[PDB]
Structures are given as structure tokens and as C-alpha cells.
């Protein structure tokens, strides 16, 4: 029975759980993951996914991964009477590692988003989310050419939530305020939202950002920004990006404005070409030249719209995994998020709810084989046109299968693998 | 001639009548002045082509019927030489009395002179079509790419409010806001102020659902993050469906109707106006183009929609737009002035052919100039009769000169087959 309060304290029977102190992460081949079942979709696709890694896992024994289940959304709410409770947050904390399905949230009106309420509470501040090609059916003719890793800040920005409604006294309190005193006119029918972007925040996702490129060998980091034309808070987050690069990272960075200078306009091997796109051009340039970027870093909202679109281009956001991490704590959690039109219909597409949870337990946990089936099993299943309807839509004659029979395949592919 | 200078220098040309617009009507005559700059760069080689391309298409469709007066006027690097200033009043004077102008691209003085326009002007629609003509194109569905984006063009952070992080104003911001309503901001923050109004909104939506009458456009999508942003693009979002209801209820069908009022099987006839967060609307636009014709958003989003739809197409430089207000329009490309290029004759010109066929083809009702001219150059495309640009993406095609391209889409104009062309698309 799922925990509904902070005197629920019950990490499951048969584990110890993942620990965290003086920089390192100890996984103790027993551990405990936290798992939210979510909204709509959710249920569905978080079912996949322990299925599916308890068969990985179990390739390659010593392990063995104990789920916690934690309550968020509409079973918070039908179990414990409120949608986000203290233990659900308590309890990720714990844990230390967690996948969540998605969770919903209304539109102008209603409840401010739990996923973001997560984020914000448990200080998940670079969200991660790789764009890879995997052989699926794809709308880019280019498709095979996107590889790319965003690294979107995930706390501030529009997403701070500092906002108020037209009619408001507050509105009218901050409409005179702004008039007065620096003279700005706003109208009295508009609501209004402020836009922070801090020096703190932007250095410790780039830094993220860079050491990230460091491990992979990645070779290209661009900041995509709006800076033209928001000069103090995405123009800075662009200065204070370029700021780290060269401070703590100099000589593993270079500058486009440098190597036109000093290496005859070519970016000289071991050496992280550090770049930057006005943001409406790099939707543009991941669209017309995938090829030339590779990590992408950008401030909440930016990141937001362009990890969407860079998914689409690869057949959807269905592929598209990612992971809220903080310093020594990660969440598990696809791109996408509820799809409530195709809530309980079995039609939905498992593989980013599986690829989060792969990116959890692989990249950040150390599990690195378990990555590697992950990506084989999915790699062969895709490449042999035995896919859900989101995939199958963009090729002629591939028929479609259903959520269920698309993971009792996908598991098949694992236990019957040459490794 | 000789373009004006000053407002008693303002004289629409001979032959020619005011367009009016009197009630919410425009009234187009069918010898209507057209006012035309030329502008810097690049920009008289391809308003030169456009005048040119258009009045053989007018001419073809409307047999002498129609006739477009082209007028005149000055801003940028032509009114400096002949006028001593970038923007003389008159010019602006003039647009207001046209109420239907043609510029090339500006070049930004090192206040930018397209802002100054569009302020006086009152524009505050921007408005771009993103279809295919054929291009090459990175996009394996760009042929089911026909939108158009109405993009709200005067509020949102684009407003310009906004405070470096050391000023003295964003740390009393900071204050103001800790004591009197208990929020945060860090102290290494710069702050921004993002407004959305319910008057800029609705003025945005109706022109949008108006132009969703005029085409036969069938759904009108609501592009917002109002999960997010509750106030701002929440508000929008609600704004946009309240006058679609409002001034349009007959015309008008929702999608939350579709699926509760309804078999989820949108009734004939009838709009569909529904809403989809702008995240989401960029990966639809990718993998679902074909369900997508008018976007209606505020300025960031509607920014951010129009250039990805324009890079789909493999159309950036040859995106067509338009600034729109009450009565009145300014086309112009998307592109800039394109220094490098500049009295070359080597420049496309198709990016202002469009915005004139924008213009003349769908806000003053001349629907026949806007077939023949798109059927003009997607024969040229087909043909790989092109510049440079386009050429360089054909191996082994010789690319048309500027001039050239001009007198193919002509010829393609002045031997088209009507019956073909205008099938369904006169009247
Ligand atoms: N943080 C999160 O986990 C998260 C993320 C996003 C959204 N949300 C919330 O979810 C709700 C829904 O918002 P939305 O409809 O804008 O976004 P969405 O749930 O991501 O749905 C967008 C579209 O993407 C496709 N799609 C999504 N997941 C898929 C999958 N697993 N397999 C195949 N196709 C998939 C479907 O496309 P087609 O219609 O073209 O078939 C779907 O209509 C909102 O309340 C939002 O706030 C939560
Ligand atoms: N419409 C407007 O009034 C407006 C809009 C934007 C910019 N501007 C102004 O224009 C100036 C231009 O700046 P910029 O240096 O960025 O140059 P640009 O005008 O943006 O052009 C840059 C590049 O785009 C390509 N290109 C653009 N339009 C094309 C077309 N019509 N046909 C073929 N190729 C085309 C060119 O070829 P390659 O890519 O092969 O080199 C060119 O080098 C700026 O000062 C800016 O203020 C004005
Ligand atoms: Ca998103
Ligand atoms: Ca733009």
C-alpha cells in the first residue's frame, strides 16, 4: 500500500537504499527506486517500463531493483485526498532515484504543474534529454543526423511562476508601481508575468553542460538564447554561460569568434566548440543542419520548446527520454507528458518511459549495460517494423501493434539476446 | 514623378483610386493605388521584380480589367539621398492613405526603421503564410505544409521591459515585490516583465478568424504554454476562444465541443478553433502539418512557429509576410537586405513576389493574382528555372540571374492555361 503521509515511512522489504555523500553515489546492487504511476497515459507506459528493466537487469543477477511506489496525480488524489503529498517528495529524497510517468496539468486555470512543483522542491535543476535516432519511422529526411543532449535550465525563467491576473489588485499594484517609478505603461487589461534569469542558475547548468561534453566527447556546445531582443535576462544567460566556458573550462573551450583568428576557421581536435544561436534560428538550424550541433544549453522555456521539437524530428516525442537531476538525486521522466486521448486505449508508445528509465539506471546510477540492451532491444524491434501507431504512421504498409504486444516484444528481444 | 518628401509632396498617382476603408469594409477599386518601397540592399532589385511579376499576372487574369497604380515612396538609403532623413513623416503619411503598401527590406541604422513603422502605423498583426513551392526541403511532408501564422505583434517580452540584474531598479523590484506580496528573486537575477492583454488579443484573433473566412481556412489553432503561464498566455488562450464565440458563433465550432456535444466528428461547415501548448503545437507541426492552417499566437511563440514551419518548407529565403492593422497592410519579406548580394542580380526575388501576391492576392480580395503567380513559380521550380539559392541544391543547374527568373515567371504567367489555373480559384 502506497504512502500517503510522512508517518508511511517504509522503504520496501528486501532493500537497502542508493546513498549519496562527499561527491559520490554508492548503488549497492540492492537498491531502492521510487516509482509514480501518474496521469492519464502514465499507468500505462510506468507498467512498461519496471516490466521491461526487470528483465534487463536480470541479464548481465548480482542485481536487482525494489519499486516504491509513490502517489502523484489522480491516485494522490483518490487515496490520500490531495495531489502532491510531503511523503511523495519525502520519499524521491530518500530514495535518492525515481521514474515518474506523467503528470497533469490544466490549462489558465486549476493547479500549478506537479511536475514543475517536483523540479522546484527537490532541486532537480538540469532536465536532460537526449535526441537520438533509433531507426523508427521519422518526418526529417534527416533524421539519422540528429544527436543531440539538451541541457535546459529547470527552476526560474516563466516558470518560476510569478504571474498575475488582469483584473487583480496586485496587477493594478504593480501596473502604478512600474508607471511611477520607471515610467512603463502597461495596460490595464493585461495580466503580467515576470521573467527571471540568475547567474547562479545559468553556471550550474552549463556546468553540467560542459562536463557532460568532457565524458561523452561531445564536441560542440551552443547556448540558444533571445538575447536580441531580452537583453538582461536571456542575453545574460547567454554571457554567464560564455563566462563559466572560459573560467573553469578554458583550456577544454573554444570560441567561433576565435577560431576565425587563431585556428584559420577550423575547431582544432580536443577542443569543445562553444557557440551560440538566437533561439528562433536554432529551431531553424536543428531543422535545416542537425548535423552541426550536438549539446544544446538553454534557459526553461527555450529548452522546453526545442527538446519537443527535436524529438519530432526523430519520430516523436513516444522516443524521447529524460532526466530531472540535481546534485546527487535524479528523476526519471519521458519528454512527453499525459496524451489523455489515448489514456486507456493500449495504443500508446512505452519506448521514452523505458529510455528514461534506462537513462536513470545506465548514465546516472552506473548500471552502463543495462543502457545497452536498453538501446539494442529497442534499436531491433524499431528496425524490423514492429512498432506502435506513432512510429508506424510514417512508413507504408507497417501495421501497427499495441502498447502491450509492442512491450511483451521488446521483452522477448531481451531474454533472447546474444550478449 | 519623384517620390515625396514632405506631406504637401503627397500625390497619389494618375489613373489611380484610394483604396478605402469605411466601416470595417475595405473597398478596392479596380484601378487601386498601391504604394511601393523600395528600400536598401537588395530591396529595389526585388520590389523591381515583384511590380514586375505582378502587373503581368494582374493583367493576365483580369484581361485590362485591373490595374494596380503603383505609388511611390521613400525610406532608408533612398529618402537619405533624396530627402536627408530614413523615415520622412510623408512616407508614413503616405502608407495611411494608401492603406495598402509593398516594402523591401530595411536596413537597421547604427531605434530600426520596421518598428517605426509598424508603431505609427498601428500593425499590429504579423502575419506569415509558410507553403511549398517545390524546394528542395528537409521536411518528407513539407508538401502538406500550408499555414499561416497570425503572430500578435506588439506586446509580450517583446514589450522591451526588463532590468539588468545590477541596477538599482531590479533590486528595488526585488523589494518591491518581497514586501508586498512575499516573492523572491535573486539578487544575480535580471529581471523581465511579460504583459498579454485582452485588447491586443482579441484585435489579433478576429483579424485571424476573419482571414479563416476569406481562404476557406477550416481550423484556427490557439498556440499557448497557458499550463504554465495561467495569466499571460492562459489568458490568451481564453481571450482568443471568447471572441471566436463572441463575433464568429455560427461560423465557429470548438474542439471541446467536438468531443462533447459531438461524435468527436467536427460538423460541416463550421470553423474548427481549437488550442493546442506551444511545445506540443512544434512537434505537431512536424509530425501532423496536414491537421494545422491558421496559428494564432502571441508574439515569442508566434516567432518561434513561424521561422521552425519556414525551415520545414526549405522556405527561409523565400518567406513571404505581412504587418497588418485595422485598415491598412505593409508586405514584406522575412529576409533582411542581404548586403552581399546587393546590385548583383543575383538575389531571389521570390520572397517579395509573395508578399505583393499576399498582399493583392489575400487582403485585397484579388485571389486570381495569387494562383497564377504561386503557379508561376512552382512551374519555375519544377522547371529548376532558378537562382542561386535554389540552384545550389540541383547539381548541375546553371542559375537564372535575378532578371531572368523575373522574365521566366512572366512567360510562365503571360502562356498559362487558365482553365487549368483557375479551376475552382476565380471569382
Ligand atoms: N512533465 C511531464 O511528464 C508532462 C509533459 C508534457 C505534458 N504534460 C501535461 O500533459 C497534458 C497533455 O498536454 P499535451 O497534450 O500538450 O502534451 P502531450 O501529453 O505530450 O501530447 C502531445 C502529443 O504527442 C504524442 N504523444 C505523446 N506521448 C506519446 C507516446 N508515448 N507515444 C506516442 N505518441 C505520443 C501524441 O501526438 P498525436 O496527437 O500527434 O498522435 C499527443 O497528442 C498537459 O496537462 C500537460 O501539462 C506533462
Ligand atoms: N525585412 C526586413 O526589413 C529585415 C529583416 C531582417 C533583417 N533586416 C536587416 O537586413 C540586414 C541584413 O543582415 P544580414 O547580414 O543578416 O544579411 P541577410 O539579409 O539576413 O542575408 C543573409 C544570408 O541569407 C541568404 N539570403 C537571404 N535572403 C535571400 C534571398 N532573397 N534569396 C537568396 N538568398 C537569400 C544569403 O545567402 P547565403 O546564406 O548563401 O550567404 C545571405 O548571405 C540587417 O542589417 C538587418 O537589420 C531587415
Ligand atoms: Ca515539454
Ligand atoms: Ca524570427
Known amino acids: 500500500s502506497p504512502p500517503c503521509t510522512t508517518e508511511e515511512l517504509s522503504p520496501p522489504p528486501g532493500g537497502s537504499l542508493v546513498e549519496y555523500s562527499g561527491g559520490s553515489l554508492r548503488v549497492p546492487d540492492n537498491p531502492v527506486v521510487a516509482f509514480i504511476r501518474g496521469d492519464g497515459v502514465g499507468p500505462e507506459v510506468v507498467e512498461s517500463a519496471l516490466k521491461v528493466v526487470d528483465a534487463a537487469v536480470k541479464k548481465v543477477g ?13 491516485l494522490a488524489r483518490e487515496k490520500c485526498g490531495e495531489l502532491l503529498p510531503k511523503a511523495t517528495l519525502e520519499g524521491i529524497r530518500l530514495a535518492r532515484v525515481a521514474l515518474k ?59 518560476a511562476g510569478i504571474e498575475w491576473p488582469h483584473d487583480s489588485p496586485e496587477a493594478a499594484r504593480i501596473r502604478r508601481f512600474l508607471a511611477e517609478e520607471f515610467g512603463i505603461s502597461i495596460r490595464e487589461d493585461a495580466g503580467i508575468g515576470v521573467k527571471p534569469i540568475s547567474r547562479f542558475a545559468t553556471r550550474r ?35 554567464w554561460a560564455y563566462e563559466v566556458a572560459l573560467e573553469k573550462f578554458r583550456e577544454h573551450v573554444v570560441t567561433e569568434q576565435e577560431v576565425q583568428e587563431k585556428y584559420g576557421g577550423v575547431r582544432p581536435e580536443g ?26 544549453v538553454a534557459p526553461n522555456l527555450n529548452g522546453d520548446y526545442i527538446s519537443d521539437a527535436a524529438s519530432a524530428l526523430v519520430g516523436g516525442i513516444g522516443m524521447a527520454a529524460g532526466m530531472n537531476m540535481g546534485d546527487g538525486i535524479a528523476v526519471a521522466e519521458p519528454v512527453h507528458g499525459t496524451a489523455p486521448k489515448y489514456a486507456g486505449k493500449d495504443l500508446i508508445n512505452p519506448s521514452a518511459e523505458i529510455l528514461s528509465a534506462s537513462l536513470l539506471i545506465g548514465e546516472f546510477m552506473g548500471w552502463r549495460e543495462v ?30 501493434l499495441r502498447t502491450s504486444e509492442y512491450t511483451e516484444t521488446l521483452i522477448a528481444y531481451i531474454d533472447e539476446a546474444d550478449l
Open 62 to 74: 548480482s542485481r536487482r531493483i525494489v519499486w516504491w511506489e509513490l502517489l502523484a496525480g489522480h
Open 271 to 296: 577542443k569543445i566548440l562553444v557557440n551560440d544561436r538566437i533561439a528562433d534560428n536554432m529551431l531553424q538550424q536543428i531543422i535545416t543542419r542537425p548535423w552541426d550541433y550536438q549539446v544544446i
Open 371 to 400: 543502457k545497452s540492451i536498453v538501446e539494442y532491444a529497442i534499436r531491433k524491434a524499431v528496425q524490423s517494423k514492429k512498432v506502435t501507431q506513432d512510429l508506424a504512421r510514417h512508413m507504408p504498409g507497417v501495421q501497427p
Open 101 to 159: 510517468g506523467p503528470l497533469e496539468t490544466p490549462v489558465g486555470t486549476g493547479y500549478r504543474s506537479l511536475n514543475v512543483a517536483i523540479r522546484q522542491a527537490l532541486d532537480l535543476y538540469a532536465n536532460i534529454r537526449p535526441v537520438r535516432y533509433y531507426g523508427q519511422p521519422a518526418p526529417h529526411k534527416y533524421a539519422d543526423r540528429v544527436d543531440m543532449v539538451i541541457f535546459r535550465e529547470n527552476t526560474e525563467d516563466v516558470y
Open 205 to 239: 547548468l552549463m556546468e553540467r553542460a560542459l562536463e557532460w561534453a568532457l565524458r561523452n566527447g561531445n564536441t560542440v556546445v551552443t547556448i540558444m538564447h533571445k538575447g536580441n531582443i531580452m537583453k538582461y535576462t536571456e542575453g545574460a544567460f547567454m554571457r
